[PDB]
Amino acid sequence: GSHSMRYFYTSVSRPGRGEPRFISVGYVDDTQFVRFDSDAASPREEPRAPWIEQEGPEYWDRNTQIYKAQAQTDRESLRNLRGYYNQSEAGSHTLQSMYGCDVGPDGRLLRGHDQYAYDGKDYIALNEDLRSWTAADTAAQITQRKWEAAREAEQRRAYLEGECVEWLRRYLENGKDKLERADPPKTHVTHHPISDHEATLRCWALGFYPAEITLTWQRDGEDQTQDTELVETRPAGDRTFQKWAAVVVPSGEEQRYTCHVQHEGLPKPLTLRWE
């Protein structure tokens, strides 16, 4: 029912303090299920969701060996990037990598991702067509030419279309309800007097999963986009998310204001008024 699997890699060079740190987190949808850290006392892939702990030592050992080879690859990537940007040996640099696959309810590949950022800027990304690259700058074009020449896109596309989707398939089988269940938001409106003439209506969504949500204020059916304060969606700490939207309303116009909550946990959106 529209699921995705993503790996987020961070490699950080530290020229004084030894070799580079490699960390990985793996996600099914908005659920973190594995982690790896090269700075762990005995670096091993570790479960971060209950439904993955059923996998045996072979799972953890195999993945650990892969992260080790990935860390090494990233070390070489960081070295090349230093040269592309004529950077000094003294500076610490960051390579962030993200790859994964989005599948429809048919469980076949809807969208594939494979993208990199160097020192927190876009570097290179595989296009939706999984057949071409977007380079952010002239350095990233050096990488583009290499990968174009060596036809590594075809390889990537085949991984994304095949293996990625089969691992996702397996994880959904193991997850069952933990991953297929959309938890609708718990909603309420609070009233915050500003002066005797004005109050802030704050519309709340809590305990929702997944993270994707739309919160909007309407005045007599018309959208108040430019006059609505909206916090970034935030983790609650229990694998649920929170968000709120706030609008400043004149005294005695409260009932003109409707808060609208869209979430896949809701068959149809909720309309809330201050009560």
């Binding site: 793996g26 992260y67 690859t73 990037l81 290179i124 990537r156």
Partner: peptide
């Protein structure tokens, strides 16, 4: 599981 193909930038 993480992919076991590796590509140098």
């Amino acid at each position: 599981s993480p992919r076991w193909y590796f590509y140098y930038l």
